[PDB]
Amino acid sequence: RIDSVSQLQNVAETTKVLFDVSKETVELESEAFELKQKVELAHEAKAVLDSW
């Protein structure tokens, strides 16, 4: 009975976490892409200015 009761809370927490984990991955990838694209444009402009 203790094991069966503990499974109900665990399954309910594990179900909610799966939806959050998928959202967190998408949000981290978007931020990482935007930061990488902005740093590339800044580095390219700086390198061209420094050479000139």
Partner 1 sequence: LDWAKVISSLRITGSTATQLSSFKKRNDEARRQLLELQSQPTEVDFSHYRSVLKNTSVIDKIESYVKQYKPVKIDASKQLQVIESFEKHAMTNAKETESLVSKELDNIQSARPFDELTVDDLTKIKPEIDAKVEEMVKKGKWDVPGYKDRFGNLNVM
Distance of CA 15 to the CA centre of its chain: 19
Minimum CB separation of residue 2 from partner 1 in Å reads 9
Rounded to the nearest 10°, the torsion over CA 18, 23, 28, 34 is 160
Minimum CB separation of residue 10 from partner 1 in Å reads 4
Minimum CB separation of residue 51 from partner 1 in Å reads 9
Give which of 4, 2, 6 is closest to 14, Cα–Cα: 6
Contact residues: partner 1, CB under 8 A: 1, 4-5, 7-8, 10-19, 21-39, 41-42, 45-46, 48-49, 52
